[PDB]
Amino acid sequence: MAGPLSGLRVVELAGIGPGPHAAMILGDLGADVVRIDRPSSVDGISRDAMLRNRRIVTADLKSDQGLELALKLIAKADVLIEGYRPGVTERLGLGPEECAKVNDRLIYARMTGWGQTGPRSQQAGHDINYISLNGILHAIGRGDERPVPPLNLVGDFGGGSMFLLVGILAALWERQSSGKGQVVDAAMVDGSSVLIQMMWAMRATGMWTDTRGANMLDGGAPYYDTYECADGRYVAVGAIEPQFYAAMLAGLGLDAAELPPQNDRARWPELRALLTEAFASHDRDHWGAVFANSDACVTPVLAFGEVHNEPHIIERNTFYEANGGWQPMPAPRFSRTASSQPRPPAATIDIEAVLTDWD
Amino acid sequence: MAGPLSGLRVVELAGIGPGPHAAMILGDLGADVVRIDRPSSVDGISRDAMLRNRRIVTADLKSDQGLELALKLIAKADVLIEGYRPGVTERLGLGPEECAKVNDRLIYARMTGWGQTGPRSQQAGHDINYISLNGILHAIGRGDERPVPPLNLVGDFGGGSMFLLVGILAALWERQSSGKGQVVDAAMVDGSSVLIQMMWAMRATGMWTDTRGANMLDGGAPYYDTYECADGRYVAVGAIEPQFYAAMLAGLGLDAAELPPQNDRARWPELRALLTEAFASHDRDHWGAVFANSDACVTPVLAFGEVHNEPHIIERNTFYEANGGWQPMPAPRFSRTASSQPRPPAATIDIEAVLTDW
Ligand SMILES: CCCCCC(=O)SCCNC(=O)CCNC(=O)[C@H](O)C(C)(C)COP(=O)(O)OP(=O)(O)OC[C@H]1O[C@@H](n2cnc3c(N)ncnc32)[C@H](O)[C@@H]1OP(=O)(O)O
Numbered sequence: 113m114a115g116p117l118s119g120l121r122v123v124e125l126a127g128i129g130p131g132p133h134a135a136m137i138l139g140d141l142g143a144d145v146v147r148i149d150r151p152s153s154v155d156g157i158s159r160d161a162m163l164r165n166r167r168i169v170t171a172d173l174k175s176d177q178g179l180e181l182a183l184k185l186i187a188k189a190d191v192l193i194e195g196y197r198p199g200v201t202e203r204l205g206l207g208p209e210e211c212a213k214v215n216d217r218l219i220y221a222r223m224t225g226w227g228q229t230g231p232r233s234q235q236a237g238h239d240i241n242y243i244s245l246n247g248i249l250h251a252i253g254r255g256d257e258r259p260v261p262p263l264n265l266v267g268d269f270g271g272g273s274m275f276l277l278v279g280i281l282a283a284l285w286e287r288q289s290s291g292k293g294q295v296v297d298a299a300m301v302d303g304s305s306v307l308i309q310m311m312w313a314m315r316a317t318g319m320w321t322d323t324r325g326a327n328m329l330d331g332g333a334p335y336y337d338t339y340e341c342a343d344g345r346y347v348a349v350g351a352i353e354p355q356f357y358a359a360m361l362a363g364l365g366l367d368a369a370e371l372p373p374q375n376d377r378a379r380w381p382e383l384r385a386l387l388t389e390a391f392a393s394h395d396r397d398h399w400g401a402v403f404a405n406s407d408a409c410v411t412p413v414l415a416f417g418e419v420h421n422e423p424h425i426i427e428r429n430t431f432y433e434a435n436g437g438w439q440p441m442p443a444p445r446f447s448r449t450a451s452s453q454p455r456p457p458a459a460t461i462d463i464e465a466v467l468t469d470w471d
Numbered sequence: 472m473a474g475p476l477s478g479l480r481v482v483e484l485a486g487i488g489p490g491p492h493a494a495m496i497l498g499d500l501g502a503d504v505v506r507i508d509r510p511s512s513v514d515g516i517s518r519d520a521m522l523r524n525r526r527i528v529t530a531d532l533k534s535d536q537g538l539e540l541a542l543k544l545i546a547k548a549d550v551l552i553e554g555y556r557p558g559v560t561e562r563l564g565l566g567p568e569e570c571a572k573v574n575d576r577l578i579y580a581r582m583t584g585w586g587q588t589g590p591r592s593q594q595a596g597h598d599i600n601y602i603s604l605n606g607i608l609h610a611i612g613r614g615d616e617r618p619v620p621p622l623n624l625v626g627d628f629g630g631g632s633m634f635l636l637v638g639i640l641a642a643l644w645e646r647q648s649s650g651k652g653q654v655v656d657a658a659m660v661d662g663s664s665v666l667i668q669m670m671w672a673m674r675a676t677g678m679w680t681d682t683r684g685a686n687m688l689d690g691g692a693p694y695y696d697t698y699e700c701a702d703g704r705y706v707a708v709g710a711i712e713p714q715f716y717a718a719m720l721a722g723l724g725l726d727a728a729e730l731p732p733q734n735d736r737a738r739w740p741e742l743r744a745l746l747t748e749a750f751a752s753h754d755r756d757h758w759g760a761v762f763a764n765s766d767a768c769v770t771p772v773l774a775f776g777e778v779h780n781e782p783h784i785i786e787r788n789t790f791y792e793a794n795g796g797w798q799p800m801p802a803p804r805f806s807r808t809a810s811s812q813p814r815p816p817a818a819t820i821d822i823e824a825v826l827t828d829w
């Protein structure tokens with residue numbers, strides 16, 4: 113198995129959203145990942161590409177034998193991932209303390225939205241809920257409209273799976289000097305708050321307000337926003353630095369002397385109207401051409417179905433073909449121990465086989 | 472120094488965006504982080520809480536002495552972070568090959584948007600540019616409007632700094648076997664693409680379309696979206712699973728018999744009209760009460776300024792106070808080697824004093 117995490121052994125108790133994602137990335141980077149699902153759900157080779165780089169086994173964890181088989185896996189592993197509500201693994205007899213008896217070296221990684229304790233800790237929830245409570249969701253969207261969810265990228269993945277990964281891998285490093293595992297408590301409401309630390313920094317220096325649509329990076333700034341083009345497609349402009357901003361104006365054909373200052377916020381509506389008219393006068397592809405090799409920070413906004421046709425994407429092999437279609441290659445990339453292309457979701461294998469394999 | 476990364480030594484070539492965010496989190500978790508800025512840059516103690524858990528030092532890397540003091544720090548460190556365009560560290564004589572000659576244990580961490588090669592590798596950009604090229608930005612916002620940037624959360628941080636962190640820490644694990652460092656190439660265009668791997672999976676199985684605002688998780692579903700309340704504030708609804716959805720309906724006072732099926736997408740206009748009118752009939756804090764302790768997946772949409780009053784936030788200490796504003800405590804959390812509260816930004820330190828200490 114190629115990648116820096118060759119020889120890492122991971123047991124994943126099947127769940128949804130962040131835990132599978134973290135498991136995936138571990139797998140991507142060459143960890144040996146064994147996913148325990150319940151026999152009721154698994155039937156067929158799974159067509160969820162998020163289950164790439166896995167061995168799937170079934171086991172009724174509520175049975176004596178299913179529990180037993182699972183504790184045998186965990187005894188042989190470096191990391192356990194679970195994404196259930198607090199208390200769930202404990203009642204299965206798979207809680208931290210039961211695991212520490214069979215393996216004091218285990219990294220015990222708990223992925224929740226609300227955390228291990230506190231008043232919301234038993235509430236069901238999804239991404240949109242976790243980001244609503246800590247200020248993030250309120251800050252996203254246009255000012256005249258209700259907030260819009262940024263898919264499930266910020267709570268589940270950015271502020272979720274990624275912090276679970278950082279914790280699993282930091283704990284493995286700590287283990288090298290201590291000889292011992294420990295519990296990683298990754299809550300999406302926490303991770304996503306660190307994810308957005310820059311806004312909390314800016315609010316304290318009076319450089320970010322709670323008004324939606326009125327900030328440098330939320331779409332309020334005319335030089336950091338999307339613009340509709342003559343063909344109804346979009347460009348993105350991200351020209352924060354005055355040098356880049358100047359370059360954009362020149363390529364739009366706009367004389368900086370006729371315009372309000374870049375950062376005079378009271379005249380942003382006026383500046384935006386001038387840029388809107390300019391961008392609207394040619395199609396997206398025209399602007400992509402005009403600004404190629406430029407520091408103007410103007411890029412075409414591609415839909416998923418167009419990404420395979422973009423030279424920069426193709427030539428760096430950001431994607432590989434599978435399946436129905438394209439999927440992202442592992443990230444990040446490593447010079448010496450490089451990841452390989454992901455292995456598609458495997459047939460269900462028997463849990464005893466795995467134990468043989470793992471002695 | 473508290474936390475799981477106690478003992479880890481980090482050199483950070485001062486940049487913007489993902490690089491400092493990654494360096495912050497390493498510091499947050501106990502790493503010993505030393506940040507080399509240019510002198511034509513630092514003018515007192517920093518106002519920027521992202522530079523917490525750091526020692527700051529000054530050095531003209533274009534001079535011979537600067538270069539050599541920097542190579543001395545790097546010789547004694549576990550990790551280097553740089554987020555300049557490709558070729559900047561090479562031309563400075565701090566490239567990977569040069570560092571490899573003074574410390575072959577080094578994790579050499581390169582944070583870019585476009586990557587180390589290819590047609591766009593030299594173009595300036597920010598978060599919005601990197602997520603524009605890989606399909607992400609186009610998927611964010613209402614169907615009746617142009618795409619809206621999800622702040623800089625998805626390219627800079629989720630798909631940038633966090634992938635840099637994973638790379639660094641994965642390479643440290645690998646170094647346990649090999650006794651050798653290596654280069655980590657973290658590009659925002661790649662990391663953000665793995666961040667959205669779900670949508671690429673669903674797209675393949677016909678469960679996600681390229682039409683903005685017409686999917687289960689983008690605002691198209693009436694049961695996964697925000698709703699304006701009587702007071703003009705908002706709640707979030709995330710009631711995907713039928714049992715949570717049924718719990719939401721009961722709290723709203725709508726009988727299921729009077730509504731279209733939850734997932735009959737052809738009747739989503741009617742369903743949205745019904746939910747819209749119901750949520751609009753009381754204020755946000757009403758709904759927050761009704762649904763607390765519930766599996767209805769209805770939560771108040773709080774503004775930054777109100778977060779510090781939310782019981783669940785207060786009690787788990789998600790935030791700490793510092794310099795006229797709250798900031799987030801480190802994440803994730805560790806049972807035995809807990810992180811401590813972050814140290815504020817300090818006055819600059821002498822690069823010699825650091826080499827000594829090390
Ligand atoms: C649509 C998805 C994409 C979007 C996802 C997001 O936006 S974020 C993802 C969702 N949020 C989270 O993941 C946060 C943490 N998880 C949760 O809050 C919760 O798991 C949930 C709300 C998602 C779902 O609540 P549920 O009540 O279904 O599940 P819960 O986690 O409480 O308990 C799961 C039950 O399955 C049982 N169980 C698990 N594996 C088993 C196995 N192999 N064999 C037998 N039984 C098994 C456990 O023993 C437990 O039983 P008991 O009944 O005895 O206790």
Ligand SMILES: CCCCCC(=O)SCCNC(=O)CCNC(=O)[C@H](O)C(C)(C)COP(=O)(O)OP(=O)(O)OC[C@H]1O[C@@H](n2cnc3c(N)ncnc32)[C@H](O)[C@@H]1OP(=O)(O)O
Binds near residue numbers: 486487507531
């Ligand atoms: C907080 C602001 C916004 C954050 C929100 C976002 O979306 S941020 C995402 C930003 N994008 C990235 O970080 C992606 C990768 N980085 C970049 O593309 C680029 O750094 C950039 C476009 C941000 C900025 O381009 P510039 O052209 O300013 O800088 P570039 O990195 O090419 O070169 C840096 C220059 O500084 C010099 N340099 C750096 N440190 C030095 C030191 N201590 N003493 C002397 N010289 C030093 C280098 O030698 C080089 O100069 P010479 O060329 O003269 O030799």
